[PDB]
Amino acid sequence: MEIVYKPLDIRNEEQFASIKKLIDADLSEPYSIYVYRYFLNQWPELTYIAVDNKSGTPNIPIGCIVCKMDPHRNVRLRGYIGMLAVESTYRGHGIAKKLVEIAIDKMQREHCDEIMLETEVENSAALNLYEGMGFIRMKRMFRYYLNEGDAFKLILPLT
Amino acid sequence: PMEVDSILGSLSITDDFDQLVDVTSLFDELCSKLKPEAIVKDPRFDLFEGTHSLEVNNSKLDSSLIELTAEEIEFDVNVAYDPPLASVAAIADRLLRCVISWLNDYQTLPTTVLSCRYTESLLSSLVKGTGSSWCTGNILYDKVLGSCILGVCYLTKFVQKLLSAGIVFEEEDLNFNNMGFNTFDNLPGQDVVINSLTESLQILEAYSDDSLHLTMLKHILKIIICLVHLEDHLTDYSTKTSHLDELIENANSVNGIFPQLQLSPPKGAFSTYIQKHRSNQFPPRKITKLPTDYSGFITLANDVKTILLVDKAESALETYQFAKFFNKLEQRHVIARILFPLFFIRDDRTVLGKFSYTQFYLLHVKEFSAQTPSSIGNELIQESSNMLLEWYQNCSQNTCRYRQGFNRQLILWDSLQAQFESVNSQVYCSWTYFMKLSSMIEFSLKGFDLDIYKPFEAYSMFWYVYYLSHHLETFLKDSQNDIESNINAIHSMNKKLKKLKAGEKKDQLRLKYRFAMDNEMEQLQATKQFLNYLLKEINITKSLCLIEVFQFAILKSFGLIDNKNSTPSKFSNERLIHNLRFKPFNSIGVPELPEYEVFQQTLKDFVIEEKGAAFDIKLERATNFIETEVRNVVSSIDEIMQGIKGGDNNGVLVTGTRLVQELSLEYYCKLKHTSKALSVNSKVIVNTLKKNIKNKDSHEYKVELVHTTEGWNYFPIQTLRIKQD
Amino acid sequence: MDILKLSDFIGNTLIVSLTEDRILVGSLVAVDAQMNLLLDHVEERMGSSSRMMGLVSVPRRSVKTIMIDKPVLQELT
Numbered sequence A: 001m002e003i004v005y006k007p008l009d010i011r012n013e014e015q016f017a018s019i020k021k022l023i024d025a026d027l028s029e030p031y032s033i034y035v036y037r038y039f040l041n042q043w044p045e046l047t048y049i050a051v052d053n054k055s056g057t058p059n060i061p062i063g064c065i066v067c068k069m070d071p072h073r074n075v076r077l078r079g080y081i082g083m084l085a086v087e088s089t090y091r092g093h094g095i096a097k098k099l100v101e102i103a104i105d106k107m108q109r110e111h112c113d114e115i116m117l118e119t120e121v122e123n124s125a126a127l128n129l130y131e132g133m134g135f136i137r138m139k140r141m142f143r144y145y146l147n148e149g150d151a152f153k154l155i156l157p158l159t
Numbered sequence B: 001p002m003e004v005d006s007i008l009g010s011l012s013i014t015d016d017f018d019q020l021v022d023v024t025s026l027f028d029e030l031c032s033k034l035k036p037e038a039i040v041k042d043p044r045f046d047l048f049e050g051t052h053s054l055e056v057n058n059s060k061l062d063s064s065l066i067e068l069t070a071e072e073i074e075f076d077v078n079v080a081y082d083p084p085l086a087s088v089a090a091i092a093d094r095l096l097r098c099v100i101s102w103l104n105d106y107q108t109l110p111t112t113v114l115s116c117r118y119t120e121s122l123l124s125s126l127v128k129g130t131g132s133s134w135c136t137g138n139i140l141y142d143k144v145l146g147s148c149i150l151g152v153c154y155l156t157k158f159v160q161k162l163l164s165a166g167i168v169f170e171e172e173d174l175n176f177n178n179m180g181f182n183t184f185d186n187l188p189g190q191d192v193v194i195n196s197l198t199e200s201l202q203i204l205e206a207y208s209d210d211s212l213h214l215t216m217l218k219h220i221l222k223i224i225i226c227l228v229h230l231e232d233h234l235t236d237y238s239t240k241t242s243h244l245d246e247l248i249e250n251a252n253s254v255n256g257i258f259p260q261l262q263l264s265p266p267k268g269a270f271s272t273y274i275q276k277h278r279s280n281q282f283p284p285r286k287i288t289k290l291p292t293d294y295s296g297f298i299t300l301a302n303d304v305k306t307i308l309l310v311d312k313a314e315s316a317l318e319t320y321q322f323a324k325f326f327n328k329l330e331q332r333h334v335i336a337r338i339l340f341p342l343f344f345i346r347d348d349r350t351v352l353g354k355f356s357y358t359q360f361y362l363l364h365v366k367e368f369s370a371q372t373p374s375s376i377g378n379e380l381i382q383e384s385s386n387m388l389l390e391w392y393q394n395c396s397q398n399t400c401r402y403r404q405g406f407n408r409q410l411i412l413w414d415s416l417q418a419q420f421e422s423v424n425s426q427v428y429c430s431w432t433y434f435m436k437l438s439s440m441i442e443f444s445l446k447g448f449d450l451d452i453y454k455p456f457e458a459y460s461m462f463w464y465v466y467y468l469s470h471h472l473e474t475f476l477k478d479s480q481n482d483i484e485s486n487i488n489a490i491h492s493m494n495k496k497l498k499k500l501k502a503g504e505k506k507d508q509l510r511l512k513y514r515f516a517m518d519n520e521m522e523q524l525q526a527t528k529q530f531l532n533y534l535l536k537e538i539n540i541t542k543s544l545c546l547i548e549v550f551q552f553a554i555l556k557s558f559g560l561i562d563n564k565n566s567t568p569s570k571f572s573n574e575r576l577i578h579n580l581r582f583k584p585f586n587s588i589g590v591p592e593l594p595e596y597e598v599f600q601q602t603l604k605d606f607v608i609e610e611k612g613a614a615f616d617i618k619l620e621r622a623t624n625f626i627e628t629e630v631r632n633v634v635s636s637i638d639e640i641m642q643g644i645k646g647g648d649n650n651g652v653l654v655t656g657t658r659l660v661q662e663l664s665l666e667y668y669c670k671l672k673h674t675s676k677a678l679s680v681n682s683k684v685i686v687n688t689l690k691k692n693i694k695n696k697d698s699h700e701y702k703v704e705l706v707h708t709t710e711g712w713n714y715f716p717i718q719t720l721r722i723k724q725d
Numbered sequence C: 001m002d003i004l005k006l007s008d009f010i011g012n013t014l015i016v017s018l019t020e021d022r023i024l025v026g027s028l029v030a031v032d033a034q035m036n037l038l039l040d041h042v043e044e045r046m047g048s049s050s051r052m053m054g055l056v057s058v059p060r061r062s063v064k065t066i067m068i069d070k071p072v073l074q075e076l077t
């Protein structure tokens, strides 16, 4: 295993489709193409993929993260993590942690004041990853994910 | 398709268009020139709007690809399936359990009530105008079942009116995706609906043969009649409990009937058909498993019955405590939660039909301060009255929104208090302060119930609430001292009278004294005994927070926890994380949010940095305080519970819990359990860690905020647990 | 004289037939480089039946054909 992390190439249609395939598998209710278009075409520099260079398919992405950033209120830039997926065979190797680190590092260099995400209250794996990075729970949303349960809103202050 | 109208309709699909030109080839050529990153769109348009779009030829996002069985595809409402009685009852039973799944289990309207083909059929004829929509020639399907569908359809329309009031948040507390159904005034009135159900009852009673299925269908019909009567509590503000009691009895009767018989509705009677063919802007959604019994109707009836009790209130404190406890122990049914503010704040702009908004507000100030304030239509009083009503409505929100509602309140109470202060209106300024500081405390402790705070943040939050509780206790202490001075002033008049002899000056002193006793003394005594209860309540809160703080300091003294994130991270710092947590209280002037350095220094005073024998002596003082203070807390809770059981006329405590007596007792019982568990847990921690130091190969522990099953989880137990792998 | 552009088509009702015998009529909200379409106020027509589906995205493979009424087409020019 020789995992390589790289930014999204918007000109690569095949890279675009592999990301959508990878993210849609884990979602109970998938995203349309224009959900993906909204993130990747407007913020191409905030999407990252992870590839296994020593695998049989080196160019295929086995993990990915999708982000955006927009002014919040009027005076602060809020980074947002909308999508995070790691292939089932590659779980438990620190790939997701590295993808979150490289994305947050990019948004910090783009002068984001804070990072925001939502996740399930029952997603222990996601809570451990984020809270161990400094995220804290700022809100609980009632049945945000319907029958999957409530959500936590996590914020990591950078400034 | 093999059907006739489908074949002929294909010819007329493009008839509405005079002329059509194929543009496929042009679109591709133009798209080829475009760059991969490019998107052609309206400049005004925001691509975020496209994130809620459907996608054709995607099973999970395309409603047209829903797979249906032949029974689902070809189900006909006009066919009377066999056996009719067994099938009509099964249909009616499933519809009622669909209602429970809708309202009690928060399932969508399309997959519950709208999944029934008869409801879809009945609603469609009402939209056009105006007798059941379908005719089978059988009396059970056409009259009995037709009445059932009308009853449920009348119910959903009433639910729609409740949601229109904006009391709760749609698609969170209650889903109303009615797939574009507007019945205007075509749906009949309440009298017609009950008569239709009553006529069907008389039909059922006429039947000579007695079957288990018939008995259930008789009860099913009576249940629907009760649900149709739910609107009486708003149209007439009725407090009568007859139809609610009948709903409970009928639900219990059916629950015992369930195991004895078997119900199988006609295949295709309930399906995802309406999602596939009716106008639908949403993705397909599977039908969720329905409740097995009718216990959900029992919960609905009891929750609504609790709502109606507030009409019996005779004081501001009785309404206040009703709002504090009626939805506190567990979340009430959404219908009851919507019903309460609509029942509490009525159509004639009155509260409970007794007082106006400003009269209701001045009642709270009078009971808290024991003062009649000598303009009318004052803007500050008007604003404060609206703020108080919003406070009551927030109590009816779900367990998450309840905490969120205080965010808005804390900054508005603060601004209100500063505006009273600038005009030197100190009585209203004082009552505003009590509400704000109480809300700050309630907002903070509620975060533990929602598991918002991580274990390392437990010291910051618990010590902050301790700090807030200390200022609230100081303020309430001064308030009671001022009340005592006024009481003693009246008492001293009586002393002065005894020393006097008959004269004109004694006449005047007796006149002043009798006025005070007749108009002031009784309220002063009640406020004194009320403030006595508040002081005991707030000292319990203060003691519990302090106990938690000591528990945290003991864990940190053993090296098991820190007041910051243990995991090192490059991106943020601990001061930024601390300020984010306390950001809601940053703009409140009094009491000022302590600076970050005060939080750190206070912890250092609590933490035992000593080692060896010195450590053991300091640790023993901390554990002895936890055990000692828990017992004092238990004694204080016991005195409060005795006061609740005895009533407000015993002369020592005034709790105003007459309407929520059982619930307030149940709450303090849960609080007493948490208190005992805090003491028991402290002993376990100390016994465990002393043994652990001795062992070089000690276990690696983590601290978790554990909820006590029968306790009150504003104060979770800081529990050790072995970290595994 | 003036070449037609995709910008001119934005905001104009289109008639889009899918691979199956269903027709989508909706206002063109956006189009991307791979001819993925986003349509608003979409009416789905299948044989006799008609229904509304709101905001729908139509991928390239799923598009059988795209047609516009001639009157509107001559205005855009």
Ligand SMILES: CC(C)(COP(=O)(O)OP(=O)(O)OC[C@H]1O[C@@H](n2cnc3c(N)ncnc32)[C@H](O)[C@@H]1OP(=O)(O)O)[C@@H](O)C(=O)NCCC(=O)NCCS
Pocket: A026, A081, A082, A083, A084, A085, A086, A087, A090, A091, A092, A093, A094, A095, A096, A097, A098, A117, A118, A119, A123, A124, A125, A126, A128, A129, A130, A132
């Ligand atoms: C969460 C997810 C991305 C992790 O995949 P991964 O590549 O194996 O993640 P990592 O190996 O980098 O995990 C690093 C840290 O995250 C936590 N973590 C990962 N798996 C965990 C698990 N079963 N249980 C608890 N914590 C876990 C741990 O803190 C872990 O550190 P540790 O070694 O001390 O236990 C994966 O489950 C996934 O694909 N989720 C998709 C849906 C989702 O959760 N989205 C997040 C909302 S934006």
Ligand SMILES: [Cl-]
Pocket: A014, A015, A018, A059, A060, A061
């Ligand atoms: Cl690839």
Ligand SMILES: [Cl-]
Pocket: B265, B266, B267, B268, B269, B270
């Ligand atoms: Cl069925």
Ligand SMILES: [Cl-]
Pocket: B316, B317, B320, B364, B365, B367, B368
């Ligand atoms: Cl009060």
Ligand SMILES: [Cl-]
Pocket: B317, B367, B368, B526, B527, B530, B654
């Ligand atoms: Cl009182």
Ligand SMILES: [Cl-]
Pocket: B378, B380, B381, B423, B425, B428
């Ligand atoms: Cl005033």
Ligand SMILES: [Cl-]
Pocket: B521
């Ligand atoms: Cl007296």
Ligand SMILES: [Cl-]
Pocket: B642, B643, B646, B650, B652, B653
């Ligand atoms: Cl008493």
Ligand SMILES: [Cl-]
Pocket: B683, B684, B687, B688
């Ligand atoms: Cl022990």
